[PDB]
């Protein structure tokens, strides 16, 4: 371990999220990240998939740069491929506040922050004004995913999200639609990645992004078997597992275990590897899966990337051990791929399923 990981995760984290809310800590790293206030990838880390190369598989979850602003940033912090969103069609505020929760007992956090967004016309001038830098980086193995929600106030999802592909589809890699249980359905998963697909396909080739589909993991299993059907038959091109969970594991010791929404990091880490290795058996591996929860070391990376994932992400490290997790993640997964005898990251893809 580096100066910096030891001093970030010992020192400074705890220090800056003792003086700070939490949604406020959250600005201030935007706001930095933004400015390229921060501290080489071996081919190992190399991973083609989704239309494009990856020069590491270690991204940005959707959420810490809901509105497009800290883009280039994050690729400067070390991160493979970049996640903004949830995007709404038009600007919203989310819920009232409080509504971000540290349990740092725990390292996790909890957060109802409600789809806060600026909305698809802010974004979309953002994405523009980079438009031909991000399309060098893309060609350099750095690509762009945009995740798309719906307003609050929306009759028909379908609509918010085919409004989301015309808009924002043209600026990105690859697109991401949020699914919710269906069952608490199928017919009407159907329609909706049916519409999102028509509407994808009617863009110019040269500007025609991948569609990921990513799911909680809080599914029943006649749930994500009927996911896993729509995904297959309808050609959708990826699935991320998972996002937050709405369940309270036992052993939670945070005071602010009890609070309302969606609870991410350590605590989620295993029901999303499972979640990933379920869902890539369901597919038969010919589905690209993102694997995102709870990682932060290169066993973390490591055990959902055997699982089944191609790539993964990492948002709430960031909020315990700041920018120099990126790159343990990193050098830890290299050493982790060398110790077990693969070649790179490609040939470690679904390893357990091959056992
Ligand atoms: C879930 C909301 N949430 C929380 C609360 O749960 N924390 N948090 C993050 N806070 C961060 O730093 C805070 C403390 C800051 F005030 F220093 F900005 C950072 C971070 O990387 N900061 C940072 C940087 F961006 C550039 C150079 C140095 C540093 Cl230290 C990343 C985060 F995800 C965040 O999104
Ligand atoms: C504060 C916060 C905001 C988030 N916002 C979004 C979002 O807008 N859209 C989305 O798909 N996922 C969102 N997520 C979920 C993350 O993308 C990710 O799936 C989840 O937090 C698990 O990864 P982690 O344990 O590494 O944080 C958010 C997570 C947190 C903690
Ligand atoms: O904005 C949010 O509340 C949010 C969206 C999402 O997809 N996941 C999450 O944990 N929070």
Not at 119 to 142: F, P
Request: aromatic share 6%.
């Amino acid at each position: 371990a580096t100066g910096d990981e030891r001093f970030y995760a010992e020192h400074l984290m705890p220090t800056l999220q003792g003086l700070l809310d939490p949604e406020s800590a959250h600005r201030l790293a935007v706001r930095f990240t933004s400015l390229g206030l921060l501290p080489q990838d071996s081919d190992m880390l190399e991973v083609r998939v989704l239309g494009h190369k990856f020069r590491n598989p270690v991204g940005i979850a959707a959420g810490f740069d809901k509105h497009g602003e800290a883009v280039d940033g994050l690729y400067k912090m070390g991160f493979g491929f970049v996640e903004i969103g949830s995007v709404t069609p038009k600007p919203q505020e989310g819920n009232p506040r409080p509504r971000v929760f540290r349990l740092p007992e725990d390292q996790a956090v909890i957060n109802r922050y409600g789809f806060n967004s600026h909305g698809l016309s802010v974004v979309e001038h953002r994405l523009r004004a980079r438009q031909q830098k991000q399309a060098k980086l893309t060609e350099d193995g750095l690509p762009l995913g945009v995740n798309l929600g719906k307003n609050k106030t929306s009759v028909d999802a379908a609509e918010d999200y085919a409004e989301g592909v015309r808009v924002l589809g043209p600026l990105a890699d690859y697109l991401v639609v949020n699914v919710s249980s269906p069952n608490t359905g199928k017919a009407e998963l159907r329609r909706l990645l049916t519409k999102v697909l028509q509407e994808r396909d009617g863009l110019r080739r040269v500007h025609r992004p991948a569609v990921l589909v990513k799911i909680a993991p809080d599914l029943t299993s006649q749930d994500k078997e009927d996911i896993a059907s729509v995904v297959k038959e309808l050609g959708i091109d990826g699935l991320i597992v998972t996002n937050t969970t709405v369940s309270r594991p036992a052993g939670l010791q945070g005071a602010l275990r009890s609070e309302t929404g969606g609870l991410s990091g350590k605590p989620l880490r295993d029901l999303s590897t499972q979640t990933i290795r379920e869902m890539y058996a369901l597919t038969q591996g010919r589905v690209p899966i993102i694997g995102v929860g709870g990682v932060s070391s290169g066993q973390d990376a490591l055990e959902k990337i055997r699982a089944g994932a191609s790539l993964v992400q990492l948002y709430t490290a960031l909020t315990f051990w700041g920018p120099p997790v990126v790159g343990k993640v990193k050098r830890e997964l290299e050493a982790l791929l060398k110790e077990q005898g693969f070649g790179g990251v490609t040939d470690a893809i679904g390893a357990d399923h091959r056992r």
